[PDB]
Amino acid sequence: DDQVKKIDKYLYAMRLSDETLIDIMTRFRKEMKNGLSRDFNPTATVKMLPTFVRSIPDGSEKGDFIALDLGGSSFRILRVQVNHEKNQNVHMESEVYDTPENIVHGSGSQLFDHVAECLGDFMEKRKIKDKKLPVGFTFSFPCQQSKIDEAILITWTKRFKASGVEGADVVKLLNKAIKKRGDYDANIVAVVNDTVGTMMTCGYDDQHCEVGLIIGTGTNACYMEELRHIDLVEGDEGRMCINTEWGAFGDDGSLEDIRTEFDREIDRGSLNPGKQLFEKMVSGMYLGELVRLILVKMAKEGLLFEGRITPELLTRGKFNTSDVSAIEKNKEGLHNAKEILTRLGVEPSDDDCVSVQHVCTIVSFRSANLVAATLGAILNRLRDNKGTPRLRTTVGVDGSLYKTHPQYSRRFHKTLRRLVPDSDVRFLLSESGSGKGAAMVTAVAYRLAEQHRQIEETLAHFHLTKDMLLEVKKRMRAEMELGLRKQTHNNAVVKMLPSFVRRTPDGTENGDFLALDLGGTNFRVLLVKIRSGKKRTVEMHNKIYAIPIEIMQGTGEELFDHIVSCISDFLDYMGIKGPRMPLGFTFSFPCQQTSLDAGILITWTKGFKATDCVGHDVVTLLRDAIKRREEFDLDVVAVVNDTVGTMMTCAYEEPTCEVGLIVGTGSNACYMEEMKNVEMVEGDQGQMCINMEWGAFGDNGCLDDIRTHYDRLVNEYSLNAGKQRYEKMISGMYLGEIVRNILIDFTKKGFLFRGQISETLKTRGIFETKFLSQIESDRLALLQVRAILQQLGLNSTCDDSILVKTVCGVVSRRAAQLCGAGMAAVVDKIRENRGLDRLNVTVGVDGTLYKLHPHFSRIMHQTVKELSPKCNVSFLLSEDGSGKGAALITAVGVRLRTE
Amino acid sequence: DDQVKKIDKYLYAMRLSDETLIDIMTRFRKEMKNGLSRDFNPTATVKMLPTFVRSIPDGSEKGDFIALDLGGSSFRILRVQVNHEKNQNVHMESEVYDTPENIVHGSGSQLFDHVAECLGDFMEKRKIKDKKLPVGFTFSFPCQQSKIDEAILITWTKRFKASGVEGADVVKLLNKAIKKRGDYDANIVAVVNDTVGTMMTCGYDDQHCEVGLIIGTGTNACYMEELRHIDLVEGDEGRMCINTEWGAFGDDGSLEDIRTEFDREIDRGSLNPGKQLFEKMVSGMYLGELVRLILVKMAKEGLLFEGRITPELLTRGKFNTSDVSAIEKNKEGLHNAKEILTRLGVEPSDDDCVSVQHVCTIVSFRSANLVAATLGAILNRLRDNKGTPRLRTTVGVDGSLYKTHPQYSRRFHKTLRRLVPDSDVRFLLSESGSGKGAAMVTAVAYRLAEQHRQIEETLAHFHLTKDMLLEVKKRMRAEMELGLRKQTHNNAVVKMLPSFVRRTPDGTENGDFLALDLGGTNFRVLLVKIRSGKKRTVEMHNKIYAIPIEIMQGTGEELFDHIVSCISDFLDYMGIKGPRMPLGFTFSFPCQQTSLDAGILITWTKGFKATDCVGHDVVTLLRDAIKRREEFDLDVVAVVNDTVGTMMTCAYEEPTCEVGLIVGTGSNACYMEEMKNVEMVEGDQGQMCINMEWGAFGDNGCLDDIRTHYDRLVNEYSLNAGKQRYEKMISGMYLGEIVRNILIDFTKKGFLFRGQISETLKTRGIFETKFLSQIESDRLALLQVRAILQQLGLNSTCDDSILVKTVCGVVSRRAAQLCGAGMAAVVDKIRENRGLDRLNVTVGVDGTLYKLHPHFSRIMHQTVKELSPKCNVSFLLSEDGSGKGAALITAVGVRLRTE
Numbered sequence A, B: 001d002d003q004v005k006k007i008d009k010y011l012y013a014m015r016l017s018d019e020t021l022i023d024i025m026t027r028f029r030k031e032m033k034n035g036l037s038r039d040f041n042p043t044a045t046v047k048m049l050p051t052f053v054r055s056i057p058d059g060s061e062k063g064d065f066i067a068l069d070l071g072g073s074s075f076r077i078l079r080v081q082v083n084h085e086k087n088q089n090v091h092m093e094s095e096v097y098d099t100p101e102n103i104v105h106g107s108g109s110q111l112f113d114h115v116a117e118c119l120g121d122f123m124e125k126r127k128i129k130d131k132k133l134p135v136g137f138t139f140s141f142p143c144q145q146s147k148i149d150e151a152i153l154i155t156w157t158k159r160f161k162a163s164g165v166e167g168a169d170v171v172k173l174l175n176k177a178i179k180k181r182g183d184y185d186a187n188i189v190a191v192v193n194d195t196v197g198t199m200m201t202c203g204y205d206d207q208h209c210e211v212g213l214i215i216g217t218g219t220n221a222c223y224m225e226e227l228r229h230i231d232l233v234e235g236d237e238g239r240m241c242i243n244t245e246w247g248a249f250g251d252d253g254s255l256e257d258i259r260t261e262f263d264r265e266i267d268r269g270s271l272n273p274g275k276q277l278f279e280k281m282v283s284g285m286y287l288g289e290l291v292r293l294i295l296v297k298m299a300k301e302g303l304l305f306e307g308r309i310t311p312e313l314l315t316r317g318k319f320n321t322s323d324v325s326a327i328e329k330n331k332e333g334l335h336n337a338k339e340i341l342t343r344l345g346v347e348p349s350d351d352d353c354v355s356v357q358h359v360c361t362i363v364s365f366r367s368a369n370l371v372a373a374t375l376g377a378i379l380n381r382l383r384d385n386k387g388t389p390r391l392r393t394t395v396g397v398d399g400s401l402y403k404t405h406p407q408y409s410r411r412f413h414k415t416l417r418r419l420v421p422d423s424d425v426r427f428l429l430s431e432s433g434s435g436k437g438a439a440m441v442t443a444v445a446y447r448l449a450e451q452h453r454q455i456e457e458t459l460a461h462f463h464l465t466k467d468m469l470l471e472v473k474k475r476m477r478a479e480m481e482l483g484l485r486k487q488t489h490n491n492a493v494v495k496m497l498p499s500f501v502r503r504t505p506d507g508t509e510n511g512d513f514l515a516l517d518l519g520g521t522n523f524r525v526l527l528v529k530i531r532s533g534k535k536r537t538v539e540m541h542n543k544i545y546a547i548p549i550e551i552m553q554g555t556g557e558e559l560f561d562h563i564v565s566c567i568s569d570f571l572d573y574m575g576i577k578g579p580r581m582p583l584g585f586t587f588s589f590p591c592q593q594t595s596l597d598a599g600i601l602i603t604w605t606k607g608f609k610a611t612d613c614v615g616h617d618v619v620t621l622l623r624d625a626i627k628r629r630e631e632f633d634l635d636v637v638a639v640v641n642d643t644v645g646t647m648m649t650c651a652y653e654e655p656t657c658e659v660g661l662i663v664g665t666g667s668n669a670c671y672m673e674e675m676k677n678v679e680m681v682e683g684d685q686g687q688m689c690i691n692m693e694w695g696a697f698g699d700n701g702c703l704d705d706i707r708t709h710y711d712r713l714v715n716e717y718s719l720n721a722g723k724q725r726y727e728k729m730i731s732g733m734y735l736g737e738i739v740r741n742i743l744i745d746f747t748k749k750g751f752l753f754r755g756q757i758s759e760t761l762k763t764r765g766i767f768e769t770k771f772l773s774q775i776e777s778d779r780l781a782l783l784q785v786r787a788i789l790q791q792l793g794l795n796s797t798c799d800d801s802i803l804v805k806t807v808c809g810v811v812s813r814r815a816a817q818l819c820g821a822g823m824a825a826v827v828d829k830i831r832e833n834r835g836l837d838r839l840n841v842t843v844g845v846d847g848t849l850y851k852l853h854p855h856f857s858r859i860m861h862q863t864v865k866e867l868s869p870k871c872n873v874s875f876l877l878s879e880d881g882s883g884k885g886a887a888l889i890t891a892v893g894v895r896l897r898t899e
């Protein structure tokens, strides 16, 4: 006893009080906060690195993969096999490869070539070198990573010191070595820390695991932290495993008050002086040597061995941590001591043995107590995160020291239970611990890799090549011809109807004109004053009127009676009733023009059911209603198509404009054609603006080779199945539906919304052009995109969001391109029509998709350029082709009945 | 009365209850939250746009500028002059330019050319067209801007509808028009909303202003909101004025429950149907017309004028908001009514006049009450932000309606005082209101513009051009020659000392060597085992030892007695005492080599003061101490320079290495020279590694033309004034000091830290290489950089941070370049030395600045490439040139005494 008491005082500084431990527990808690915070992270010693592991094995894990484990006591290679069974275990085998101490102090190159050399042999000796099995990599060192399969070595720790690796990506470095040999082919799908592997390996057997603890050569702990606490990782949903890297605890001076002269000497003779100061007070790679130093000091003071000092006792590394354990055994502790010490050349006395055994006890007890303190900080942290008064969790443990020291386990648990009282912690030990762990993470990594490989293949069908685009342009052009020729027009799908607008405005237009814009329940009347002065100027007014459904489904005699009623109101509203004014009539329903002022209605749409209108000439129905009133008289000069109105509106300013285009809910285009070509209208002189009605392009199957399964579904479920095939791959009314139908598919395959098909996802037209234009916005953050989706009614996650945005993108790009191939055919036909080799033409466009969408117009333009280089086409957003345009068509109209 | 009562019931829906108003107040509060939040902002109708105005006039405002005001009742141009006086007012004049109604409905082009045309005239008529005065621009429309001098028109409101402007930057569009004419030159320094101008114009006279309220043609309110609440603007310090754009309140349906059939008809006949729904219930541009519609409906029902309806009463725009005011005058209200109505063709009865006057009252009272409600929401918001129980603030008001209606002011204040009770609000009216406002913002904008112009000029001196760099390279080369030649060596500043290392390792090296690394209080001894096996392998160990200051300032006999004591310890530590081992001696103090194993100490540094060492040969002092002990014997084979050790260490692996470089606290470089050239050492055969000591380059004034005022200050205040000029523009020991000296300067000029010179800013060496390497980090966010600074002890702001980072950048770039020009001279001399036209050489480098810094090594490399294209130089980070290197020099040493 006297002896033991003499050591206790000598090593008093190595005997920490609970008061002290709690303090240390508190200091670490602060180091944890700083490392997580984005403000102090820059200069924090406890790195708290994100592992990018968001959950423990859910069981659904299955596969066959390899696993490397480098950085611990020994370098082993495992082949883990997690398969499907009826409550039966998982199989796995491992092999340890000797790694020369002069190899971990060499060049990164030699080291990774060694690891590669050992890998190939392992697979070959098992001849599984053919089936490229996924490879997991457990690397126990602080690594920076922004994804599971990347690992930038922050620095080396423990006994490694290979140059040319720090600051580099070990995965690339390994892939580099595996290549150099080319003996085989490896798939490093993931890189994980050993603490992570341990937590995984044990969480598999216990879904309560949230902490991985390593206590061996080195020491470290990882836990499950709230994303909303990990400032340096964008997100807020779920959890992510954090790699504290607590071995560096104190590397900034925080622990100088508890470190002794022996601790500092141990540091001076170390590979990484000044680093991992806490670790050097705890882990097994240092325990043995720490005791030796204490023994040398004592012999030197004649406190032990009667001052006798031998060359062996002074040689670094002669007293291993394994002697510390042998000496602390309950049974043969003191006998082991005598043997060990004796082997050191010393001649120990019974007193010497007891003393040396108490030094061991004091040194290893400190290790235990210190780790209880820091682990307790992680427990309190978990207790706070869950807001629970008492904590219940399972800790995954591993490490040569913890597993082989006879007293560590017990002392560690005892002290821990005394510092962190309101909690019941379960400690699960693991066989390989990080062997099966890297496998579970690899498993998930592979999984997500296939999902992406698949998703990429599905979206590939939407990728049109410049050659396909040329065919599309080729085919559109042929369709155009069939519709112009008189011999095939009746059977053509791209009708190419004549608008009877023989000239674009020339500036000579001057006057006051009325326009009627009818295309729904809310139509409008307008007054447009045009002054052909020195300076072109046009002012206008307009009021909107409603059409009671009762009248929409009225008798056609009431419909036009009501409309003239509204016009009668407007004229008074503008204070201009009296004179016989000219009026342009924009009729946005399926019509067939037989003259500038005549158009037969082929079918009602948008809810109109007025009787005795279909088949009749709308302009006559209007003229008849006007006369029925006898209050005033108008001179209906024309019936107008809004697309044609859009070009006219544009031509008025930009004279090189001879093409109009609409890309909104629907799509159409027009252009000035040569009369000699309009076989449907007598006269080979002059020009004629043609209203293509190009949305029917492909209605005879000519696009059937570029349409996808989702294009077909959208058609199958559309109201006009088999019709408007082209407009269905380009208009804002369907784009969302192609998108929605892809999402449903992916949801079923389980790549989105947890495989759960939402009711909102089942609703058609949920993805309007407005919301389609947002999700793809450059100025939007993924957290906003996610908000938008959730706002629609989709329980999307940051991850879902990334997916939905990609799909949208794929669909809208093809839309713009397919639109470009179309537009590309028109301009070239115009060029060739006039026998030119270079054409400069402007196009007037309108439409909520072209206008609101972030990338449609751009990609569209890029495309027309590639497919039609002999043409220099310019696109100008021209609005109100239905009002201003109809008026301009009217002004040009009256102007021409004079010539 | 009966009449009045008959109207009250007829227009019951226009009479809002306080219950209703408070509800609306609450709805707006929610619209304010959504617009500010990054989650709901995407689809929010109340945009809550950031104005980038962080404070009201602080008085320090002074200058002479112009101001444009477009978008309100009239387009005026002001020339405001805010100067320094003894409590006397500010001067300003304005001029209104007629803007044709057919001009605000035309093209953006014509509109901005009109504004330009009006601008030039204004300045010319005042002939101030010569002095390019700053120009302020008040544009009253929702604009997107990320900086004061940018304004992307979201959309048009009120009566503007010029095409080609929405979605574009009006500033560029204006600058575009001012150019087209080129009559003059304008400086649009800022663009502000009218609400902002009003708040500014009134905050100037009252530092309590936090709200700008407009009630005229249109209606809108801006206030001062907490940056920590403006999710869409990075930051958290101070305040920023938010432009609510509340006219759009309800544009999503939120107010359909309080809008009447008259409100909806007013919308149908509007320019922007469906937009600014709230505004259309309040502002002056609509009040008049809203009453007309109510009157038409009543006549039609024979409720007024005995049902008589006239063409005038039905003409839109015949009843102006100015008639609403005339009619509500206390004195001549009913007489004004009779006159007005009569002018409308109606024949009003006294009863009719009373009724029409009550309609006005009911309509204008609603306007007042509605704006009280929404303003009250902004007050409650301000009360909450300041956490005060009762609110005290000043509101800046303006608007034709508010200023000209006889009853508005009174009704508005009354209702407001009843809804928002715990607060005293001061209402300041402004003359031009936005005239003097745009001027105060312009003032500040100009100010910051000059600071940047200045700062840019100061940092320009640090910009070296490729030609200067070539001169530097030219001069370095000449310096090199003077130092090699025997006739000028004694007077050369770049000493070019011979290291006596005649060969780089060749691989033949094999053995066990000791090294002593002495360069401070903590030196180390090392054992390096080198095996020239089939595979190159080298393992080593080392312990660190301290030198008590008492011994550092000892007698030189004790210093080397102590060192040999440490070596004696180490040999036992490694268990190898006995044999006579070889030892390399790295002596990192000002030494002069006279042989491979001899070096005279020219002067102590780093606190050493040991006596009788200076002038003596350190290797002899060591050999003498060894012999004094008689415990063992060593074979000191060499005295080493760490730079030379760095190259050797590198050559060992990369055989093309013949140049070493150190860039850390200090800087030096070495390279293999041709013996025929080393005039200081006999023998024209073989080579000789030269230790340049290039830090003294420029010590004779040869760099005096590229050194700056701050370079001189750093020298002036350095411990070795006039010496190490080159090393002072490149080493990590001074870079921070050049930086710190610039900051102090800028602080004085008042461009940083509020002109306040911190005590921390006065501390030298505050900017260590570590912190210099961080601030410039690509992976760091400005909020972190700011944290770092504040962590140093600098009360920096996000803005300060942006500045400090730029300075650092300027300084560290020149450092790398100046280093490159130097390195560039060595490689070329080697090339030319061997008469080659292409040279491939590797350079071994080390140093905390080169290693830790984000951009040093890169820019350095880029530079050596440009200046030395006949050379293909490769840079390899080679570490431990002081230990491993000293050993390699020793191994090569013993190996050569055999040849």
Ligand SMILES: OC[C@H]1O[C@@H](O)[C@H](O)[C@@H](O)[C@@H]1O
Pocket: A071, A072, A139, A140, A141, A142, A157, A158, A193, A194, A195, A214, A216, A217, A218, A219, A220, A221, A245, A247, A276, A279
């Ligand atoms: O091996 C246990 C631990 O040792 C520490 O030194 C390393 O930095 C960690 O990566 C590792 O988890």
Ligand SMILES: OC[C@H]1O[C@@H](O)[C@H](O)[C@@H](O)[C@@H]1O
Pocket: B071, B072, B139, B140, B141, B142, B157, B158, B193, B194, B195, B214, B216, B217, B218, B219, B220, B221, B245, B247, B276, B279
């Ligand atoms: O003119 C007053 C207000 O009118 C609103 O319609 C505009 O959108 C605002 O920019 C302006 O502040």
Ligand SMILES: [K+]
Pocket: A227, A228, A229, A230, A231, A232, A233, A234, A235, A236
């Ligand atoms: K986060």
Ligand SMILES: [K+]
Pocket: A675, A676, A677, A678, A679, A680, A681, A682, A683, A684
């Ligand atoms: K024809």
Ligand SMILES: [K+]
Pocket: B227, B228, B229, B230, B231, B232, B233, B234, B235, B236
């Ligand atoms: K903010």
Ligand SMILES: [K+]
Pocket: B675, B676, B677, B678, B679, B680, B681, B682, B683, B684
């Ligand atoms: K010579």
